[PDB]
Design a protein around this ligand. Structure first.
Ligand code: SAM
Length: 257
């Protein structure tokens, strides 16, 4: 049994109180108060539509994925990754796909900087989408469950779905459950063919073991995964540490050339 699986069982043992104290212990998170207030008033400039704009920003500002050209955003939800990429100088097109409907977030229209190169499309199940030419492949799909075997299957399905989109392009792909042995085997095969590394984002909650497979990096996958399981296990053992609060992103306004 893996370190990750032991973490999961401990997480499933927690009360809602213990869980709520645990999920943010020691993490980093952005302050959404201003954005939530302005979005509630219908403002369409400056605000990120979700915490996701800041999450992708963390990887980009570290050169782990460098978005360029035609960007595909699989599972875009409200659009936080798509709107963020739309303001980056090398990006020329952003196409987001998400399921919508009951249980799922719908794209939110915005006029943040570069909005004119974004098209977000709801009613799209990516597991039925034919792959398209693109220079950056982004994917943030993976629903948590209390069952890690369910999570194993959802993770493997995503990795099998993304591979035909990958053709010597930039990428950032969520790996919901990276500690199950079968997932490891797949990731190791994928890194051999397409390179990259798995990376833990500091803005991810302790309630998920998600890691992101990014195109610009090298490293040992098993080692990076076990380090996260050790980190998440250690955070059970202490009284809640309040999260390191950071400033949310300002996505600006206006068209781009
Ligand atoms: C964590 S959210 C992504 C957030 C987004 N990156 C942002 O910045 O706001 C994951 C999204 O994937 C969508 N999703 C889940 N399964 C999907 C599927 N099979 N096809 C398309 N979208 C899916 C969910 O509805 C959800 O909106």
């Amino acid at each position: 049994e893996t370190l990750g699986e032991k973490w999961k069982k401990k997480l499933n043992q927690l009360s809602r109180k213990e869980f709520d104290l645990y999920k943010k212990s020691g993490i980093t998170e952005v302050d959404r108060t201003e954005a939530k207030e302005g979005l509630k008033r219908g403002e369409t400039t400056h605000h990120a539509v979700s915490r996701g704009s800041a999450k992708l920003q963390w990887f980009v500002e570290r050169n782990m994925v460098i978005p360029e050209g035609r960007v595909i955003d699989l599972g875009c939800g409200r659009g936080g990754w798509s709107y963020y990429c739309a303001g980056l100088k090398k990006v020329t097109e952003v196409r987001g796909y998400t399921k919508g409907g009951p249980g799922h977030e719908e794209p939110v229209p915005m006029s943040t900087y570069g909005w004119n190169i974004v098209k977000l499309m709801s009613g799209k199940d990516v597991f039925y989408l034919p792959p398209e030419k693109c220079d950056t492949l982004l994917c943030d799909i993976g629903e948590s469950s209390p069952s890690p075997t369910v999570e194993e299957s959802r993770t493997i399905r995503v990795l099998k779905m993304v591979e035909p989109w990958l053709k010597n392009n930039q990428f950032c792909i969520k790996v919901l459950n990276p500690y199950m042995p079968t997932v490891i085997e797949h990731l190791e095969r994928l890194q051999r063919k397409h390179g990259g590394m798995l990376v833990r984002n500091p803005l991810s909650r302790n309630s998920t073991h998600e890691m992101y497979w990014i195109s610009n990096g090298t490293g040992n996958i098993v080692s990076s995964v076990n380090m996260v399981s050790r980190l998440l296990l250690n955070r059970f053992t202490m009284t809640h540490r309040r999260p390191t609060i950071e400033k949310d992103v300002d996505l600006g306004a206006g068209t781009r050339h």
